[PDB]
Short mmCIF file of C-alpha atoms and ligand atoms in Angstrom, two decimals:
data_model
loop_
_atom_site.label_atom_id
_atom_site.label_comp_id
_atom_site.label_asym_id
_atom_site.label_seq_id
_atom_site.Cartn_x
_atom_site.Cartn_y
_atom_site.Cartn_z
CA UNK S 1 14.66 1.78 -11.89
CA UNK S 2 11.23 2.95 -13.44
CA UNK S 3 10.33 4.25 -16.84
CA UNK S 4 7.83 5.80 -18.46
CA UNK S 5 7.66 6.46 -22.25
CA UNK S 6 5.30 9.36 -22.91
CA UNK S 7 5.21 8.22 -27.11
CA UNK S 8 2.52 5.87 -27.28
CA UNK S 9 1.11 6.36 -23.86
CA UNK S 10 -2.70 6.26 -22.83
CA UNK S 11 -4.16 6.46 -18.95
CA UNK S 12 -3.33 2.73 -18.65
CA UNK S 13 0.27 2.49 -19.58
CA UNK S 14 0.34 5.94 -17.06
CA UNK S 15 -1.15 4.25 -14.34
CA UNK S 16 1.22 1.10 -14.70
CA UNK S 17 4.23 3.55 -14.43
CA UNK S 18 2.60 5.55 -11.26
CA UNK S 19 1.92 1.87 -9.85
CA UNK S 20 5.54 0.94 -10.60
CA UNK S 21 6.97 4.12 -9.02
CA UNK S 22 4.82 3.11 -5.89
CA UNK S 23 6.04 -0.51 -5.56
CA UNK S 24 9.60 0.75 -5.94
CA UNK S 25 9.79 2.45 -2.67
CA UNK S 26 10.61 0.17 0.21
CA UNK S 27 8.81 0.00 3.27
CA UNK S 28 8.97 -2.62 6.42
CA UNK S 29 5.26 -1.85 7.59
CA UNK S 30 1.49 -0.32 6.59
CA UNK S 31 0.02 1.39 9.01
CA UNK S 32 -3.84 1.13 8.76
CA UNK S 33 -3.23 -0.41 5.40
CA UNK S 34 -0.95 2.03 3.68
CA UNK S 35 2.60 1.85 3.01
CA UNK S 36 4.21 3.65 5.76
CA UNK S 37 7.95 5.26 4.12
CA UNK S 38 11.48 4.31 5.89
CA UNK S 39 12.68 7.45 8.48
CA UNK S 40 16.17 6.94 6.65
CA UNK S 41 18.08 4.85 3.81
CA UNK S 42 22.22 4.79 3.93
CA UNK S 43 23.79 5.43 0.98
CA UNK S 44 22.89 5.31 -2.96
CA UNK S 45 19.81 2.94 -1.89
CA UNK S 46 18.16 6.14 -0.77
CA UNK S 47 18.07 7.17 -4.53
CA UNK S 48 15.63 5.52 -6.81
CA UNK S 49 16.35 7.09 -10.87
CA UNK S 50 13.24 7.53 -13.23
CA UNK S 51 13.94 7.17 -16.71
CA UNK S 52 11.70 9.71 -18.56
CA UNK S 53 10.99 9.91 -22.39
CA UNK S 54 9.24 12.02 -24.59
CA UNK S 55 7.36 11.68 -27.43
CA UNK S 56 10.53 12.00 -29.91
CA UNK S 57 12.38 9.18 -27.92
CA UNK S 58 14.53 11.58 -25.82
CA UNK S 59 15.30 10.84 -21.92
CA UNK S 60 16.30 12.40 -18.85
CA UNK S 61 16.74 10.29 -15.78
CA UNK S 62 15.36 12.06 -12.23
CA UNK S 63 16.93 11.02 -9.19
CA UNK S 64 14.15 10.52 -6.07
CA UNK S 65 14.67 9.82 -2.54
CA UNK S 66 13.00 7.04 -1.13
CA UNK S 67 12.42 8.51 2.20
CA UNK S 68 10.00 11.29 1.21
CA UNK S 69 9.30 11.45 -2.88
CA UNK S 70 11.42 14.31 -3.70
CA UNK S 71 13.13 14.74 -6.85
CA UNK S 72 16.34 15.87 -5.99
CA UNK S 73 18.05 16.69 -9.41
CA UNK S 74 18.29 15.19 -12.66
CA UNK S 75 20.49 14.33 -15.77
CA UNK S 76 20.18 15.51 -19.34
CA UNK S 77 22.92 13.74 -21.71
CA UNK S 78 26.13 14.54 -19.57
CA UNK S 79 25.28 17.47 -17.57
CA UNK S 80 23.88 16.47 -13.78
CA UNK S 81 21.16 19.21 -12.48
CA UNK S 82 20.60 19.62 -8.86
CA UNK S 83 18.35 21.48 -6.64
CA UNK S 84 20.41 24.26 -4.29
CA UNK S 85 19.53 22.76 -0.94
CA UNK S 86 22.02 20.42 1.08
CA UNK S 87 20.27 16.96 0.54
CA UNK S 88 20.19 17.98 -2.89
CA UNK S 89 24.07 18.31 -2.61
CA UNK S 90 23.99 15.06 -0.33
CA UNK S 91 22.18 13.14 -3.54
CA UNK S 92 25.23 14.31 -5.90
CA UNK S 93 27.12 12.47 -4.26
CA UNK S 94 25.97 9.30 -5.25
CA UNK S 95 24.25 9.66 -8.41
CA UNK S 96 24.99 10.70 -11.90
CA UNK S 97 29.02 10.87 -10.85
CA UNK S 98 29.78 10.01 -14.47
CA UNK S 99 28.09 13.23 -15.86
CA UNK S 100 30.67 15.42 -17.23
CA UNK S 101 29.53 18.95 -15.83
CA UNK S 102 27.19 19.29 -12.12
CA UNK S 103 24.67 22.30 -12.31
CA UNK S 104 23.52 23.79 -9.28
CA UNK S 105 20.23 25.01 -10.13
CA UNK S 106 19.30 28.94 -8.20
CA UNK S 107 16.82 27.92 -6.28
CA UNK S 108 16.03 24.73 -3.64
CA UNK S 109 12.83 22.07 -4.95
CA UNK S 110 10.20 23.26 -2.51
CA UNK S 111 7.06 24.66 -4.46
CA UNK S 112 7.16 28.25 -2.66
CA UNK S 113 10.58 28.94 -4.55
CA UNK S 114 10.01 26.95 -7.85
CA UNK S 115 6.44 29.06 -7.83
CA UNK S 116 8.86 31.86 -7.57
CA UNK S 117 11.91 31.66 -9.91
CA UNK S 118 8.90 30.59 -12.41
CA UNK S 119 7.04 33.83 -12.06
CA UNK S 120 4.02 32.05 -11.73
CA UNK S 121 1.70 30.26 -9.15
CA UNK S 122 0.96 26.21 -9.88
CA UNK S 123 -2.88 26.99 -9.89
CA UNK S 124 -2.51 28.67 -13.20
CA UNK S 125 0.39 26.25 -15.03
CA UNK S 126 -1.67 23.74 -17.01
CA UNK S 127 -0.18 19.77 -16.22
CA UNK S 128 -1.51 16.48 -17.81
CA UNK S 129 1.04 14.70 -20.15
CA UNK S 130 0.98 16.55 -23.09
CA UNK S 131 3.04 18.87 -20.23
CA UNK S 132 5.01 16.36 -19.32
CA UNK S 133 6.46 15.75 -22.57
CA UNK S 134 7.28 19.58 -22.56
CA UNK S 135 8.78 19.34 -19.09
CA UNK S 136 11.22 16.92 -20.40
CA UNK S 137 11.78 18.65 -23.87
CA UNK S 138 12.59 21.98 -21.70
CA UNK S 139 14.61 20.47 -19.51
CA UNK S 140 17.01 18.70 -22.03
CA UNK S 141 18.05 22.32 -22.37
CA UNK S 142 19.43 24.03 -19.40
CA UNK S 143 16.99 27.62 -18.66
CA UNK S 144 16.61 28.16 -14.98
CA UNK S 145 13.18 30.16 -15.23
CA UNK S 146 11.77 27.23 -18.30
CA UNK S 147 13.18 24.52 -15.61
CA UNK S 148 11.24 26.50 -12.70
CA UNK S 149 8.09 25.25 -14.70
CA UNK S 150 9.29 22.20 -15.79
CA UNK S 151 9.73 20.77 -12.91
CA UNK S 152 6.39 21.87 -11.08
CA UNK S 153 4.72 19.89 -13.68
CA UNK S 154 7.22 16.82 -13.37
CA UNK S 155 6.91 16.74 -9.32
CA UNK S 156 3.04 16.79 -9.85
CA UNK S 157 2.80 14.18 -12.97
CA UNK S 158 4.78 11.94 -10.66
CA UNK S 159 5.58 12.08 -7.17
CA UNK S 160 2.51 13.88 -6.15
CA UNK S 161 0.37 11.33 -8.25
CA UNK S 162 2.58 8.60 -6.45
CA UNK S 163 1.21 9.83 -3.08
CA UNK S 164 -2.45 10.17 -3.88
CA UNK S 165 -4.98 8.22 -6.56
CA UNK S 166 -6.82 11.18 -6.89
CA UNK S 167 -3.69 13.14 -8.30
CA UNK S 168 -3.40 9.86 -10.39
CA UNK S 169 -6.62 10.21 -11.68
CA UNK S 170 -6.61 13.67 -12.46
CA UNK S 171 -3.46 12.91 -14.60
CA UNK S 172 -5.16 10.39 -16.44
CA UNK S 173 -8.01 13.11 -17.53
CA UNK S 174 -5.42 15.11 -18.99
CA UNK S 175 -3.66 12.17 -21.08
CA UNK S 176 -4.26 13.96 -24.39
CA UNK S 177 -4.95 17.80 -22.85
CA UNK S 178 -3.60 19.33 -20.39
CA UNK S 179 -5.59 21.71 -17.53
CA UNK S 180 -4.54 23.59 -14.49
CA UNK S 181 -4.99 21.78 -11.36
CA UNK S 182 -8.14 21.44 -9.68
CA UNK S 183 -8.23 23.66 -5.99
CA UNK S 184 -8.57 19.37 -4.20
CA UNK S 185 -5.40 18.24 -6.31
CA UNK S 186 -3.52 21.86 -4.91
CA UNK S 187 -4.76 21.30 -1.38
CA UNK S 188 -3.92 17.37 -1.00
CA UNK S 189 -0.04 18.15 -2.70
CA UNK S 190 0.12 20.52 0.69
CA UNK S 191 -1.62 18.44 3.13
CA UNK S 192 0.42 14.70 2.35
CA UNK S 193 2.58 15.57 5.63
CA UNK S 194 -0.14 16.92 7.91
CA UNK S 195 -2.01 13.80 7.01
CA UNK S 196 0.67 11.72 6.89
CA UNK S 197 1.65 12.69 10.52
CA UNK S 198 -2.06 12.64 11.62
CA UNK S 199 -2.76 8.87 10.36
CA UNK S 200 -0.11 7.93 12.27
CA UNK S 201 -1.09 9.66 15.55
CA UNK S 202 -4.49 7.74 15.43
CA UNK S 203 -2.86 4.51 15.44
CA UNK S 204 -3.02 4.26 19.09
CA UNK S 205 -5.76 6.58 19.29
CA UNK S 206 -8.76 4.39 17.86
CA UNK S 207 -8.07 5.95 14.41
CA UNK S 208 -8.95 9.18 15.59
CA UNK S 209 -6.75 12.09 14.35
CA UNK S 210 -5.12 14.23 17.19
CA UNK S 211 -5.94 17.47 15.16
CA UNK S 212 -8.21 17.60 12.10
CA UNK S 213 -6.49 18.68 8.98
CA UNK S 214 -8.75 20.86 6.27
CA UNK S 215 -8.90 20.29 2.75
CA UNK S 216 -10.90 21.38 -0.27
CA UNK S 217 -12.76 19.05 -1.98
CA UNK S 218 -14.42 18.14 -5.30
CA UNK S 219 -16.58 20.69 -5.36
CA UNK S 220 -14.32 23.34 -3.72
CA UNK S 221 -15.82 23.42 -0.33
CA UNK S 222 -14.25 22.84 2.66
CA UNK S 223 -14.19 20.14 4.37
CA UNK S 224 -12.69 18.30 7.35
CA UNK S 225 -10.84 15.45 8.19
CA UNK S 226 -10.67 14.21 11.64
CA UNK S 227 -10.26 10.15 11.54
CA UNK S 228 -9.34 7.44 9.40
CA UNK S 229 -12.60 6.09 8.12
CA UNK S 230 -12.65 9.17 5.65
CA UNK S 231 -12.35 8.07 1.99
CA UNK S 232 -9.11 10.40 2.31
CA UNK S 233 -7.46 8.03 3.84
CA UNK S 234 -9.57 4.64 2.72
CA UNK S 235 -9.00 5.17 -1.03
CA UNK S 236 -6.70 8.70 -1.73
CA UNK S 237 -3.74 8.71 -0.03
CA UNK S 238 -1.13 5.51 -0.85
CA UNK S 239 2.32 6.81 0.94
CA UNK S 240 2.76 7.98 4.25
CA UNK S 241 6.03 10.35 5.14
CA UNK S 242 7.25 8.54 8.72
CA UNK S 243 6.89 11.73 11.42
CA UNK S 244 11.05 11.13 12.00
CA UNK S 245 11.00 13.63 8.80
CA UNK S 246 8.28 16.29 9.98
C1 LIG F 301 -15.30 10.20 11.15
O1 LIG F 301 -15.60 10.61 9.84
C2 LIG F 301 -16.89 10.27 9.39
C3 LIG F 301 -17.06 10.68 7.96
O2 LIG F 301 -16.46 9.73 7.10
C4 LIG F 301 -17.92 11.02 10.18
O3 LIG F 301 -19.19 10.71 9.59
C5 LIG F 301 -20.35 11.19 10.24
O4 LIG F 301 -21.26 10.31 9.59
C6 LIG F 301 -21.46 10.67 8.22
C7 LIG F 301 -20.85 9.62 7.31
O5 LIG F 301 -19.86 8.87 7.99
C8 LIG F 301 -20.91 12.07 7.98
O6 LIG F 301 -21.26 12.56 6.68
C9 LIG F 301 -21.56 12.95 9.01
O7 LIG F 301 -21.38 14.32 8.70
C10 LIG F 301 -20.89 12.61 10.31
N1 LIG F 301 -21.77 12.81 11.43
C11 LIG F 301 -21.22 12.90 12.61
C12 LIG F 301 -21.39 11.72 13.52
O8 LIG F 301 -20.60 13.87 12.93
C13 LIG F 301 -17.81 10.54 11.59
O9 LIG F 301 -18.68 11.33 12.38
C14 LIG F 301 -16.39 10.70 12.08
N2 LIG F 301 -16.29 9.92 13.26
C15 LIG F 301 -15.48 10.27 14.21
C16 LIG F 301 -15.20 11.73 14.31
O10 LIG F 301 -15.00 9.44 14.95
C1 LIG F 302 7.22 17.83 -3.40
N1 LIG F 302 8.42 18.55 -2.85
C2 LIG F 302 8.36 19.41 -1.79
N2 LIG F 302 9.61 19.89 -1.48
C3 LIG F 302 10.47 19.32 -2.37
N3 LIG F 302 11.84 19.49 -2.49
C4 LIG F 302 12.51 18.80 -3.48
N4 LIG F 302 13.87 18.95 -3.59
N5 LIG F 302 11.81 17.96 -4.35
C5 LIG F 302 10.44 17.77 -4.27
O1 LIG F 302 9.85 16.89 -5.16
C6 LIG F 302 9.74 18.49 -3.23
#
């Protein structure tokens, strides 16, 4: 298991955690140097739990599945809470079992419904982890719209920063105030399967993507992507999503 203790943290203790969460997903093989993720896991080794406190001490332990990075539900004291979507319901089945009452949450863990039950679009919720620390606060209390934006800020504090340095980096910035997300940070969190596919289609292709996949940078201009010598894939990206999930 991995934890991360938001009361005395700092970017380095952060990026320890974010490194932690990285080296606890398995993986058989790297393909042009990063860590490609397993098509499948059987049983409750396809669940890795996050223990999560915040600044007063208190915890709530997120299940993830190895496979792909997505939080599938979580626990707060004794009550379970998971997404409405059937791997979701496949994760209950094996985690948190001694929880006294299971919570289906209204709505499944894809951004394009939490954006929804949350009334409001990720570009304008502010993260860092000042946020987090609220995430977990609001979510020791069950409130499906407060969870909505909750968890939007706990996918992109951690699995989201898992998958890319930059998101990592931009976390770190906000370690003591917390900003909206850059346009880059939004565009990378919905490109990390198009690329991941793509880096895998150039491995017997020279390196050379089979389609290019557009992104925003920096600056807010687009840009391109169309083989791996990019600094995209050199230094950004550190998971890849294996194309038996796309
Ligand atoms: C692959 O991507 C690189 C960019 O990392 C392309 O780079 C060209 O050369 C410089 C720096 O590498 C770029 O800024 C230029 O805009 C690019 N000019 C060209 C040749 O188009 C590189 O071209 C790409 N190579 C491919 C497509 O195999
Ligand atoms: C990032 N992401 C996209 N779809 C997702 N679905 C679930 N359940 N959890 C996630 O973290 C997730």
């Amino acid at each position: 298991d991995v934890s991360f203790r938001l009361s005395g943290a700092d970017p380095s203790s952060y990026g320890m955690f974010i490194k932690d969460l990285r080296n606890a997903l398995p993986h058989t093989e790297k393909v042009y140097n990063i860590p490609l993720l397993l098509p499948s896991v059987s049983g409750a080794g396809r669940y890795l739990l996050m223990h999560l406190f915040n600044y007063d001490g208190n915890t709530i332990t997120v299940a993830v599945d190895v496979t792909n990075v997505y939080i599938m539900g979580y626990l707060a004291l004794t009550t379970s809470y998971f997404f409405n979507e059937p791997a979701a319901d496949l994760a209950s089945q094996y985690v948190f079992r001694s929880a006294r009452r299971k919570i289906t949450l209204p709505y499944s863990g894809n951004y394009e419904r939490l954006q929804i039950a949350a009334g409001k679009p990720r570009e304008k919720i502010p993260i860092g982890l000042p946020a987090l620390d609220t995430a977990i606060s609001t979510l020791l209390h069950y409130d499906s719209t407060a969870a909505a934006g909750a968890l939007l800020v706990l996918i992109q504090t951690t699995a989201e920063a898992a998958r890319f340095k930059y998101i990592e980096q931009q976390i770190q910035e906000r370690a003591y105030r917390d900003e909206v997300p850059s346009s880059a940070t939004i565009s990378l969190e919905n490109s990390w399967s198009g690329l991941s596919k793509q880096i895998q289609l150039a491995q017997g292709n020279n390196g050379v993507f089979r389609t290019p996949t557009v992104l925003v940078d920096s600056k807010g201009n687009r840009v391109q992507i169309t083989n791996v010598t990019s600094n995209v894939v050199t230094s950004n990206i550190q998971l890849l999503l294996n194309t038996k999930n796309i």
